[PDB]
A = this chain, B = another copy of it.
Amino acid sequence: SRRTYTLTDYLKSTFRVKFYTLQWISDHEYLYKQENNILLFNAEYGNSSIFLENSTFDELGYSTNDYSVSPDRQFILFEYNYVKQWRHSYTASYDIYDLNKRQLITEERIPNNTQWITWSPVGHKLAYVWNNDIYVKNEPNLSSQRITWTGKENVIYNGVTDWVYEEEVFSAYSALWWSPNGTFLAYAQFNDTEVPLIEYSFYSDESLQYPKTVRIPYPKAGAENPTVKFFVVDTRTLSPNASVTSYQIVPPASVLIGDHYLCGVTWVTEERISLQWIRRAQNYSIIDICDYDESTGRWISSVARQHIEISTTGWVGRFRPAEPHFTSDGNSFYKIISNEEGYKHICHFQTDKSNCTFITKGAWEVIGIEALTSDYLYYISNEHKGMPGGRNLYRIQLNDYTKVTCLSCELNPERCQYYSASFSNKAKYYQLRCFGPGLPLYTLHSSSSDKELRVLEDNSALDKMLQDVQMPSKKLDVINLHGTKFWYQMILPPHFDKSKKYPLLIEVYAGPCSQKVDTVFRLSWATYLASTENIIVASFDGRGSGYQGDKIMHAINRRLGTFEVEDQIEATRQFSKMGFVDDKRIAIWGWSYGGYVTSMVLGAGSGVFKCGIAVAPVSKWEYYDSVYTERYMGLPTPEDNLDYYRNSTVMSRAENFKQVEYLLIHGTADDNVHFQQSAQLSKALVDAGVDFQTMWYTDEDHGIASNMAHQHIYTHMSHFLKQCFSLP
């Protein structure tokens, strides 16, 4: 026990944190890949059975990265040849295996380079996208029926999102929604025709004699956006000799006026579908409940069935309006919206009415709704011990909003304060995933009596390994800024000697609705800095952050680069007042927004920080995509918010950099925050005669996650830091 958590321990993950992944296929049974073989687990008893032996897994092409079984358990889908694209997107090859015949389907296979594929809700239909067009396979071995013909690379998307909807509006590649019983298949169609193209070089493998130019339809603040169309297809008439039967649903008049987005799709019943649209502005979204008319095939909507959500201080929801949770009969629904006091809370809605009733209230927020039986409502919130960085499972009794109980609060009060859950089909069971403050813990529960049932994964192996290495200690706490109570966290080195003055590192994100202060357990770069380098690392959630109410979160509305930056400075000061902090050796580092924030801090000329590192940071908001940017800044026009766009650019503070040591990093293949941003920033600094450091990473993207790149960037930021702090 005379060794520490080294840099290599971090980069090689020599300390394995185990998890437990399962899939609910019934209301009490779940699948679990063990020793390379799926097993069916019976939640009620704990007894399992082989659902698919390993061996049967014959490295088809490469490796079986993912599998999905049809709902009737007659077939299982195998995914191989996975080729990542953006953040959620990717292509792959797919095999379908017959669990009856126990053979592999060989006639009529799924196309190579498939973009998205999915079993229908019931039975074993399949819907999939390929070359931006949709295809429906009722039966596996049979042929597939093409549903669209407009698909075109980089221009028209049927069933899958383009770059901006994938990154900022759905957070997923898919834009396909089967009806509850497989009758209808809904999809979105995207048109990127007038969206400008972002282009950059991809050098590829050393042997390529000429670099390639990657081209992506990418709308930057204020530029032409992709347009959208929604379609509902009746798969009943899908026939090789038949036209396709589909109805196009348009947005209510209030959104249809100017530019807009489609932010959500939720089937209520085989004949009732809920669409949620939001305006480009984003301080006005609306739910439109549409019902099928059996006599015309049309899908009708109406005023009685529309619900408008707006914001006067900013944008709707956290990163999009929260999703509606309908009751089985679909006549009412539950959904999180801001308070009269700005706290996110569950309101109960009537499908054909306009008034709603909150069933939760308090100086805390509801993170999300987890399940909804005819009796209870299961959700997750940060109310416990009033700390916003905590997560717990609650169950509220629908006939008495007073009868609210906490299922995770007391299970392991010290080790578990941050949870997420996975409910079984009817909410008879759930798995409780504890991500911290102690080692992660996975357990299974019965909804009937709320009994421990059993433990799925306690990371007892990890714990064993750690008590033979000097780990850092992390403490959460509050500090006061301009009246408001704010949270912070410090990763303190081992053998904490208060008489000693320790160099301090601020690890910062600080983007709207962000939260860098929580109880999640993490084995990170800071672990190594605290443990081995004896550097205290801290984080602060100030104005603009989230899960604390709109007042705090909407604070930076239309003025990014201001309060959240200042607040980091103001808080580091207090941190420097303390005695174990060597106020003459403090740095600040951050990625993406945090790389932006960090850069603004250094150019602030507060003389508080000695140095900082910015990795793939936003430098000028007119360079970032438009869905995100415009949500917090409006349009860059002098008739709107041009002035605050122009003065929140890191380049505007170039001269102050003459006062600190700056390390600038970016991947030449960043498709998210373009390399342009840092190229433009370093050019402004050269032009201001400022000296600094840079580190470009050839062909790496926003995550600089290739193995060698990952190792190298961290190894590099550590040398820069030990030099900024003159450490051995």
Bound Cα distance A200, B200 (Å): 7
Cβ-based interface call for A414 (8 A):
no
Q: Which of B210, B620, B694 contacts A206 (CB 8 A)?
A: B620
Are the CB atoms of A680 and B206 closer together than 8 Å?
A: yes
> In the complex, what residues of B have CB within 8 A of residue A699's CB?
679, 683
Are the CB atoms of A201 and B201 closer together than 8 Å?
A: yes
Are the CB atoms of B698 and A682 closer together than 8 Å?
A: yes
Interface band, chain A: 35 or more
Among A341-349, A375-383, A685-693, the stretch in contact with B:
A685-693
**Closest B-chain residue to A669, C-beta based?**
B679
Q: Which of B210, B676, B693, B711 contacts A201 (CB 8 A)?
A: B676
Min CB gap A290→B, angstroms: 38
Bound Cα distance A680, B683 (Å): 22
Cβ-based interface call for A196 (8 A):
yes
Are the CB atoms of B687 and A679 closer together than 8 Å?
A: no
Bound Cα distance A438, B152 (Å): 69
Cβ-based interface call for A198 (8 A):
yes
> In the complex, what residues of B have CB within 8 A of residue A716's CB?
691
Cβ-based interface call for A386 (8 A):
no
Cβ-based interface call for A696 (8 A):
yes
Cβ-based interface call for A209 (8 A):
yes
Cβ-based interface call for A522 (8 A):
no
> In the complex, what residues of B have CB within 8 A of residue A687's CB?
708
Cβ-based interface call for A725 (8 A):
no
**Closest B-chain residue to A206, C-beta based?**
B680
Min CB gap A212→B, angstroms: 8
Are the CB atoms of A689 and B668 closer together than 8 Å?
A: no
Bound Cα distance A211, B709 (Å): 25
Are the CB atoms of B689 and A203 closer together than 8 Å?
A: no
Bound Cα distance A719, B690 (Å): 13
Bound Cα distance A210, B677 (Å): 10
Report A682-728 residues with CB < 8 Å from chain B CB: 682-684, 686-687, 689, 691, 693-699, 708-709, 711-712, 715-716, 719
**Closest B-chain residue to A706, C-beta based?**
B686
Instruction: Kindly supply a per-residue 1/0 record for chain A positions 88-131, scoring 1 wherever the CB is within 8 Å of any chain B CB and 0 otherwise.
Output: 00000000000000000000000000000000000000000000
Bound Cα distance A716, B649 (Å): 24
Are the CB atoms of A679 and B691 closer together than 8 Å?
A: no
Q: Which of B203, B694, B715 contacts A676 (CB 8 A)?
A: B203
Min CB gap A611→B, angstroms: 14
Most chain B beta-carbon neighbours within 10 Å: one of A197, A223, A695: A695
Instruction: Kindly supply a per-residue 1/0 record for chain A positions 169-213, scoring 1 wherever the CB is within 8 Å of any chain B CB and 0 otherwise.
Output: 000000000000000000000000000111111010010011101
Are the CB atoms of B691 and A715 closer together than 8 Å?
A: yes
Are the CB atoms of A694 and B691 closer together than 8 Å?
A: no
Min CB gap A329→B, angstroms: 50
Cβ-based interface call for A286 (8 A):
no
Bound Cα distance A201, B201 (Å): 7
Cβ-based interface call for A365 (8 A):
no
Are the CB atoms of A698 and B680 closer together than 8 Å?
A: yes
Cβ-based interface call for A51 (8 A):
no
Bound Cα distance A210, B196 (Å): 8
Q: Taking the full assembly, how many copies of this chain does it contain? A: 2
Cβ-based interface call for A615 (8 A):
no
Bound Cα distance A715, B198 (Å): 33
Min CB gap A58→B, angstroms: 31
Bound Cα distance A679, B700 (Å): 11
Cβ-based interface call for A651 (8 A):
yes
Bound Cα distance A667, B198 (Å): 20
Are the CB atoms of B691 and A206 closer together than 8 Å?
A: no
Cβ-based interface call for A623 (8 A):
yes
Are the CB atoms of B679 and A698 closer together than 8 Å?
A: yes
Q: A668-B679, A683-B699, A686-B698 are in contact. Are A200 and B201 (CB under 8 A)?
A: yes
Are the CB atoms of B223 and A211 closer together than 8 Å?
A: no
Are the CB atoms of B676 and A689 closer together than 8 Å?
A: no
Cβ-based interface call for A220 (8 A):
yes
Most chain B beta-carbon neighbours within 10 Å: one of A200, A201, A709, A719: A201
Cβ-based interface call for A323 (8 A):
no
Are the CB atoms of B691 and A203 closer together than 8 Å?
A: no
> In the complex, what residues of B have CB within 8 A of residue A668's CB?
679
Are the CB atoms of A198 and B213 closer together than 8 Å?
A: no
Bound Cα distance A721, B682 (Å): 21
Most chain B beta-carbon neighbours within 10 Å: one of A196, A649, A682: A682
Cβ-based interface call for A518 (8 A):
no
Bound Cα distance A680, B620 (Å): 28
> In the complex, what residues of B have CB within 8 A of residue A209's CB?
196, 220, 223, 622-623
> In the complex, what residues of B have CB within 8 A of residue A211's CB?
198-200, 674, 676, 679
> In the complex, what residues of B have CB within 8 A of residue A676's CB?
201, 203, 211
Min CB gap A88→B, angstroms: 24
Min CB gap A646→B, angstroms: 10
Q: A679-B696, A680-B698, A716-B691 are in contact. Are A201 and B199 (CB under 8 A)?
A: yes
Are the CB atoms of A712 and B686 closer together than 8 Å?
A: yes
Ordered by A's residue number, 30 sampled pairs between the chains whose C-beta atoms are within 8 Å are A197-B210, A198-B210, A198-B211, A199-B201, A199-B211, A200-B211, A201-B201, A201-B676, A201-B679, A203-B676, A203-B680, A203-B683, A206-B620, A206-B649, A206-B651, A206-B684, A209-B223, A211-B674, A211-B676, A211-B679, A668-B679, A679-B696, A686-B709, A686-B712, A691-B715, A691-B716, A691-B719, A693-B693, A694-B694, A696-B696
* Residues on A facing B (Cβ under 8 Å): 196-201, 203, 206, 209-211, 213, 220, 223, 620, 622-623, 649, 651, 668, 674-676, 679-680, 682-684, 686-687, 689, 691, 693-699, 708-709, 711-712, 715-716, 719
Given contact pairs A206-B620, A209-B622, A679-B696, enumerate 10 new A-B contacts (beta carbons under 8 Å). A196-B210, A199-B210, A199-B211, A199-B213, A200-B211, A201-B201, A203-B676, A682-B698, A686-B698, A689-B712
